[PDB]
Design a protein around this ligand. Structure first.
Ligand SMILES: [Ca+2]
Ligand SMILES: [Ca+2]
Ligand SMILES: [Ca+2]
Ligand SMILES: [Ca+2]
Lengths: 338, 338
DNA sequence: AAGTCGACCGGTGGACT
DNA sequence: AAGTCGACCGGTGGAT
């Protein structure tokens, strides 16, 4: 559970344990001895808890503590079973903690979207936990989908075919000149729900926890929307970075720039909103770095001039992340006709 | 020395050793037991050796083994003095190996600059080791300085005050709109030598090795040129990354775009040349990534659009690194009037 | 399927203050 | 100084 429990831990099938012993089944080219079972850790720690939508204690708890809990539980489990034999590289904890930060945060936003969408289709404003009711006029056309995007994703694949074609022919021409304009992906995209889906309950249901079925539901969602999103319907891009270093700031800054060049410059979309979330900015310089103007618009006679990255957000609690996303939708979705 | 020597290691004062035992003098908040003394490692391994300018075997050796030598030498010393107690985090090796790659490569380029400059002032082409003789007409005005740039550096500070003022005025306008366009730094910049310095011999002197005094000379050089470089005289920027990961590509790509926007767009400089060096690209993805057209080149839509990053270079040997740099200077310096 | 590729970030040694 | 600030990259768990 969220709070570690030996009983709960003993009740776990060997393959459900947070630590997997691979001392006898090594990974080729790797001297790894114990693996952090990331999916098992999410199921154990957050199987019945989505922070911000759980007990008032968890919702208002320091988000750093919430995010660090799965690894802590895992290390507690490994220590119990293997004592002094238990060993995991720093880089194992780094990789997993990053994924925990992203996945959990995306789940928080997923439930935000569910509650938002329910309101949009004319139901009430669910009251527990308590968040401020949006002032925006409800409409099914103002629903959104929260899409955790996979490694190796190209965000262009979200767009309707005709918009993809504009981009493809733009690049094709660049190539015959020895140039390219590859696109990677933000960690997450919030998109206006396609009309086709605007009465599917899927997008209006809050999940109770990151059980395996729910992990899969959230991580697979983007597939349902590929080739269905209009350029202006990419409402928000988010890059999660649990901590920052000066050299690890530039991927979201660059991708934001490319998204803006393509969507605003080539496809006539409004300002593309792209933000970065972190738990540990390690100084004030990352904030300055993210004050940078989007480059394309700096050329005369191009698109609107604005920041590439709208904000570097440091969520103090899960409840604050939820509050901020609701407030964002309240503003951004006003641009969408009811 | 380059080849480990038990004797030479004995001759070392303990403060000169490559492995510092801090088991009883811990770093505050750290459980580090042994430290990788990086500057000591450079003096021990390269004190009398600049690869590409040393013995034939070292010049032609796999550059990976050359750059990997200081850490290998360090581990040997550690295992000697401390046996099974000797241990270092992979993150210590990562940090040190990265610095070695950059510093050694920069030293190679420094000696290249020295030889080029000697040629430019009419002293002929130093023949040992033997590299192809540049064909470009010699001129004191075509001398260059290789500047290993420091942490927290802003490349704009290299520029003559008049050019710095142009950039500040541009940013002033941006700050009025809540925007900005900060500049960081490449690892290294090659700049045309200011006329004021074109008969100073330090710039034509090849160093014998990375003794501590020579480390300081190379690492301090940029201070001598600050506020003296013309915008069009920033001739090459280099970013060193010993290995690549997909998320670690974007700082040079982004910074190159900004350099192009400011130097080419605001200051009328010729094409800004910015390259990335690595020993381990880990696939072909990075090469594709670095084929990207300049964002502000696309923004301007002039007759010629060029890449932000000119090349991703994987040096096979220190001699190739030297050869490539000489050939680059032979072409680029043609843009400077004799 | 399971394997080959994606992308995750934290502990480090040195310069500056 | 010892404390604070930059920027280095390598080992990881899993997804058509
Ligand atoms: Ca993801
Ligand atoms: Ca991320
Ligand atoms: Ca540097
Ligand atoms: Ca570098």
């Amino acid at each position: 559970p969220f709070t570690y429990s030996i009983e709960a831990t003993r009740n776990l099938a060997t393959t459900e344990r947070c630590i997997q012993d691979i001392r006898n089944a090594p990974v080729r080219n790797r001297s790894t001895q114990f693996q952090l079972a990331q999916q098992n850790m999410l199921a154990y720690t957050f199987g019945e808890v989505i922070p911000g939508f759980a007990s008032a204690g968890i919702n208002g708890m320091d988000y750093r503590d919430v995010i660090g809990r799965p690894v802590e539980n895992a290390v507690t489990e490994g220590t119990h079973f293997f004592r002094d034999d238990f060993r995991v590289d720093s880089n194992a904890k780094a990789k997993v903690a990053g994924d925990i930060f992203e996945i959990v945060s995306s789940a928080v936003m997923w439930n935000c979207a569910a509650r938002w969408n329910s309101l949009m289709v004319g139901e009430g404003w669910r009251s527990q936990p308590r968040y401020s009711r949006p002032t925006l006029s409800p409409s099914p056309r103002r629903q959104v989908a929260v899409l955790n995007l996979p490694r190796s994703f190209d965000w262009v694949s979200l767009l309707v075919p005709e918009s993809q074609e504009v981009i493809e022919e733009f690049r094709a021409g660049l190539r015959k000149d020895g140039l390219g304009l590859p696109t990677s992906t933000p960690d997450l995209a919030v998109v206006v729900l396609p009309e086709e889906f605007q009465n599917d309950e899927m997008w209006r249901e809050e999940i109770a926890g990151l059980t395996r079925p729910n992990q899969i539901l959230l991580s697979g969602a983007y597939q349902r929307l590929q080739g269905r999103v209009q350029p202006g319907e990419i409402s928000l891009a988010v890059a999660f970075k649990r901590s920052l270093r000066s050299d690890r700031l530039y991927q979201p800054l660059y991708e934001a720039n490319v998204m803006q060049l393509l969507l605003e410059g080539k496809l006539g979309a409004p300002k593309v909103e792209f933000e970065v979330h972190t738990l540990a900015p390690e100084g004030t310089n990352a904030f300055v770095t993210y004050e940078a103007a989007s480059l394309y618009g700096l050329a005369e006679g191009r698109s609107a001039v604005h920041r590439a990255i709208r904000e570097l957000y440091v969520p103090p609690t899960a409840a604050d992340l939820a509050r901020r996303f609701f407030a964002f939708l309240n503003e951004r979705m006003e641009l969408v006709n009811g």
